[PDB]
Structure formats: C-alpha cells, structure tokens
Curated annotation (Swiss-Prot):
Expression sites (tissue/organ): Detected in skeletal muscle (at protein level). Widely expressed with highest levels in heart and skeletal muscle.
Protein's cellular compartments: Cell junction, Adherens junction; Cell membrane; Cytoplasm, Cytoskeleton; Cell junction, Focal adhesion
Modified sites of kind Phosphotyrosine: 13
Assembly with partners or alone: Interacts (via third SH3 domain) with the Ten-1 ICD form of TENM1; the interaction induces the translocation of SORBS1 to the nucleus. Interacts with INSM1. Interacts with the long isoform of AFDN and with VCL. AFDN and VCL bind to SORBS1 in a competitive manner and do not form a ternary complex. Interacts with ABL1, CBL, CBLB and INPPL1/SHIP2 through the third SH3 domain. Interaction with ABL1 occurs only after insulin stimulation while this has no effect on the interaction with INPPL1. Interacts with the insulin receptor but dissociates from it following insulin stimulation.
Highest taxon of source: Eukaryota
Native source species: Homo sapiens (Human)
Modification note: O-glycosylated.
Purpose: Plays a role in tyrosine phosphorylation of CBL by linking CBL to the insulin receptor. Required for insulin-stimulated glucose transport. Involved in formation of actin stress fibers and focal adhesions.
This protein's name: Sorbin and SH3 domain-containing protein 1
Domain SH3: start-end pairs: 4-65
Length: 65
C-alpha cells in the first residue's frame, strides 16, 4: 500500500544498500516507487521482500500497469 497503481520499476541490477533504510535491489526484482527525490534516488517498496525505504532509481526501469 504505497498508493495503489502509482509507479512501479524493475531492477536492472543487484544493489547492496548503504543502510537498512535503503531498499535491497536485485536484478529483475520489482519496486513500487511512492516518493521521488529530485536527486535521482526514489522511495519505494520491494515487491519480493516487501520492505520499504529509499532506493537508487538508477538501477530500475519504468514499467507499466
């Protein structure tokens, strides 16, 4: 429950978060982004492990819904 069908991305790479407040990105995993930082990193939730935080939207690709 980030919003509903707001915006979902698929991970291009597997990324190791610098903090537990960041989201674990894994190659092919999907993350729904709820909030956008203009700095490029976004806030989302992991579709696989359902964790919430910030993730670098540099490792994800714009999907459709």
């Amino acid at each position: 429950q980030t919003s509903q069908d707001l915006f979902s991305y698929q991970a291009l790479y597997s990324y190791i978060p610098q903090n537990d407040d960041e989201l674990e990105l894994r190659d092919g995993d999907i993350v729904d982004v709820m909030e956008k930082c203009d700095d490029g990193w976004f806030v989302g939730t992991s579709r696989r492990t359902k964790q919430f935080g910030t993730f670098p939207g540099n490792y994800v690709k714009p999907l459709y819904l």
